[PDB]
Paper text:
The LRR-RKs HAESA (greek: to adhere to) and HAESA-LIKE 2 (HSL2) redundantly control floral abscission. A receptor protein called HAESA is found on the surface of the cells that surround a future break point on the plant.
We next tested if HAESA binds other IDA peptide family members. (E) Structural superposition of the active IDA (in bonds representation, in gray) and IDL1 peptide (in yellow) hormones bound to the HAESA ectodomain. Our comparative structural and biochemical analysis further suggests that IDLs share a common receptor binding mode, but may preferably bind to HAESA, HSL1 or HSL2 in different plant tissues and organs.
Numbering used by the authors:
A (entry chain B): 67 to 78
B (entry chain A): 18 to 46, 50 to 608
């Protein structure tokens, strides 16, 4: 429903 | 007896307007109402609280529950409460302190009369519904509200300025709605008790207003997924209790504030995907730092040595920057480093030996740098590693013997370096390996037979090395294999006649080796082969006619010792460049 308030897990 | 009678009646009336397919409320249908599921009473047997979280209930909002005269808390979190909220729904709820309607199926607008009907609220959550229209300006009239969460709906218009009057607010969550492009209202600076401000995905534009410097109790500031502009204000540095700053995916520019390093309370900092320039601040004493993300910016300079003061740092992602110099030799030794992606920078020098010092390291991504020297033997004992990408560096020497057989290792990408040696038989240990990517190196020796046991492998890409000997017959019995590229090596012998195990093979590329014999017949039976390059070899005999079953993107059998006739499908002159350099071959 809603993404959490925290860091991005975008990585290579 | 009396307040038990009244309350049992009110609760059962509420239940009859709901539908309960999981039978969560069976205990409501002999015993006292105060011991029913989800129901809490005070000492005089009045219902104080009704918590029906995750009970799979379906139906309109059970407003009959507000007829319970001492009800302070109502939770219907995570149900299938549907329809819209009327003005009349909260007519009798004036005693409520806590209302949680998050994770339901509510549609329509929030009622403007809500604050008048709910004057005593401290906690209001309607997160994760399908609510629409604007947030009523009348929300400024709440005299007691401590936590407001309307995140994850389709609310429109702009965040009302009148919210600034609700000075009792300690948490304000409006993230992930459909607001029009607009600025963060200045009045929100009035909310000087705020600990959490979460306005992510709110279509915000402009600078962070100067008035937000009055929010000196911020613990969590989250403004991700907007188009905010200007500097990251340096007053975030003088928040005494700040734990999380999230600014990912805005248009922030200028420098990180220099004073950042004195933010001792900070746990998580993300300013990735911005237009930040300048250096990473130095004299960092970020003791509680767990995560730093500054990827996709235009940062330059070194990673400061004083990052090694962050003894709890677990995630460091700085990729896609212009960072220079050598990394701290002691990086990781006294940290629980877990994810490290420094790809696409201009780093140089050796990779620190104790980067996996405390044994937690899972991702080691360093693509497209100028790292040099050899890989430490400590890394070769780092059994936590799942993902390793070291391609396009200046690395050299031999890989540690244990590094090829780490249990959870899924991706081993070493390509475009000067690595030497043979691949040891300890590669048998890598039971989770999917992708081996070792092209453009200077490895030598045989391809081990042990690889064939690793049933996971989908890719074996080892072009441009000095591999020798035969191709193991083991490699045929790898059902999941997709890509086999052993082009430009010194490989000799033949291809196995039996290849029915290669059901998933798509690319087979063996160009520029010393291979021999005929092309097996079963290559044409392979059901998903689109790429076949056997050129610059010593393949002799007749081209099998079964290759006409395939639809190939690439077909190259040039520069071999082939003989006989080309199959009639490939007879036309456009295919002719695929067969040049073969002595005994003609077209009819
Ligand atoms: C980081 O930057 C920005 C955030 O500032 C972000 O760009 C946004 O992404 C969304 C979706 O990812 C894009 O919005 C789209 O809008 C069009 C219609 O105009 C549609 O293609 C989509 O809207 C539909 O969404 C539903 C389906 O999922 C439908 O049911 C509905 O009816 C809609 O028509 C789509 O969402 C847009 O590019 C921007 N939007 C805004 C407001 O900024 C970017 O994606 C982020 N990138 C990363 C890597 O984080
Ligand atoms: C919302 O409620 C549903 C239903 O109670 C929850 O789904 C259950 O999740 C737990 C695991 O935490 C499992 O034991 C159950 O088997 C699940 N049941 C069903 C029907 O899926 C769900 O976890 C709740 N969601 C949240 C976010 O709390
Ligand atoms: C609440 O909103 C969501 C998102 O609009 C709806 O769920 C699904 O939305 C996707 C498109 O984003 C469709 O492909 C699905 O078919 C939708 N589900 C349906 C129509 O049942 C959801 O329907 C909305 N809920 C209510 C009660 O209106
Ligand atoms: C088939 O493969 C051969 C090599 O096995 C290709 O010939 C090479 O082409 C490149 C072009 O960049 C040259 O640098 C090499 O010198 C060529 N090698 C030889 C031995 O001639 C050929 O072009 C490929 N043809 C097709 C149609 O894919
Ligand atoms: C509530 O849900 C049920 C079944 O899921 C449906 O039949 C009923 O009409 C819904 N009410 C509204 C207003 O959508
Ligand atoms: C609430 O704030 C609005 C605009 O921010 C202001 O006009 C109004 O006077 C305020 N009302 C009260 C009761 O503080
Ligand atoms: C960091 O230094 C600046 C002064 O240059 C100051 O405003 C700020 O309060 C300091 N931060 C902490 C957490 O002590």
């Amino acid at each position: 429903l809603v993404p959490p308030s925290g860091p991005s897990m975008r990585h290579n | 007896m009396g307040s038990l009678n009244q309350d049992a009646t009110i609760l059962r009336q509420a239940k009859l307007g709901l539908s309960d397919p999981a039978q969560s409320l069976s205990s409501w249908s002999d015993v006292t109402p105060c011991k029913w599921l989800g129901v809490s009473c005070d000492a005089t047997s009045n219902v104080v609280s009704v918590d029906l979280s995750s009970f799979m209930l379906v139906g309109p909002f059970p407003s009959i529950l507000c007829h319970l005269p001492s009800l302070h808390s109502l939770s219907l979190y995570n149900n299938s409460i549907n329809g819209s909220l009327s003005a009349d729904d909260f007519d009798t709820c004036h005693n409520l302190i806590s209302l949680d309607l998050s994770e339901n199926l509510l549609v329509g607008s929030i009622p403007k009369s809500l604050p008048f009907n709910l004057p005593n609220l401290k906690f209001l959550e309607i997160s994760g519904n399908n609510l629409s229209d604007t947030i009523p300006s009348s929300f400024g009239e709440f005299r007691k509200l401590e936590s407001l969460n309307l995140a994850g709906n389709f609310l429109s218009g702009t965040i009302p300025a009148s919210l600034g009057n609700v000075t009792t607010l300690k948490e304000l969550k409006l993230a992930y709605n459909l607001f029009s492009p607009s600025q963060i209202p200045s009045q929100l600076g009035n909310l000087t008790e705020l600990q959490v401000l979460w306005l992510a995905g709110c279509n915000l534009v402009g600078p962070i207003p100067p008035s937000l410097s009055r929010l000196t109790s911020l613990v969590n500031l989250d403004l991700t997924f907007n188009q905010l502009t200007g500097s990251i204000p340096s007053w975030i540095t003088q928040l005494k209790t700040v734990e999380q700053i999230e600014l990912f995916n805005n248009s922030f520019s200028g420098e990180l504030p220099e004073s950042m390093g004195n933010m001792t309370t900070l746990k998580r900092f993300d300013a990735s995907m911005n237009k930040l320039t300048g250096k990473i601040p130095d004299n960092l004493n970020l003791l509680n730092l767990e995560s730093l993300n500054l990827f996709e910016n235009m940062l330059e300079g070194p990673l400061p040595e004083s990052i090694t003061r962050s003894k709890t740092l677990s995630e460091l992602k700085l990729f896609n920057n212009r960072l220079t110099g050598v990394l701290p030799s002691q990086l990781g030794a006294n940290s629980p480093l877990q994810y490290v992606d420094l790809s696409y920078n201009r780093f140089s020098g050796e990779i620190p030996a104790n980067v996996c010092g405390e044994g937690k390291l899972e991702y080691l991504i360093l693509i497209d740098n100028s790292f040099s020297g050899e890989i430490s033997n400590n890394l070769g004992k780092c059994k936590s590693l799942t993902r390793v990408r070291l391609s396009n560096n200046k690395l050299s020497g031999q890989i540690p013997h244990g590094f090829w057989g780490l249990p959870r290792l899924s991706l081993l990408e070493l390509s475009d370096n000067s690595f030497t040696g043979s691949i040891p038989k300890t590669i048998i240990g890598a039971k989770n390996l999917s992708n081996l990517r070792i092209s453009k190196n200077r490895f030598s020796g045989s391809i081990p037979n042990e690889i064939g046991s690793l049933n996971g492998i989908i890719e074996i890409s080892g072009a441009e090395n000095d591999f020798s000997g035969e191709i193991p017959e083991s490699l045929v019995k790898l059902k999941q294999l997709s890509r086999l590229d052993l082009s430009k090596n010194q490989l000799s012998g033949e291809i196995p006649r039996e290849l029915r195990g290669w059901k998933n093979l798509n690319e087979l590329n063996l160009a520029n080796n010393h291979l021999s014999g005929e092309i097996p017949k079963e290559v044409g039976i392979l059901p998903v082969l689109n790429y076949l390059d056997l050129s610059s070899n010593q393949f002799s005999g007749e081209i099998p006619l079964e290759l006409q079953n395939l639809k190939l993107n690439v077909l190259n059998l040039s520069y071999n010792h082939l003989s006989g006739k080309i199959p009639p499908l490939y007879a036309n002159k456009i295919y002719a460049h695929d067969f040049i350099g073969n002595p005994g071959l003609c077209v009819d």
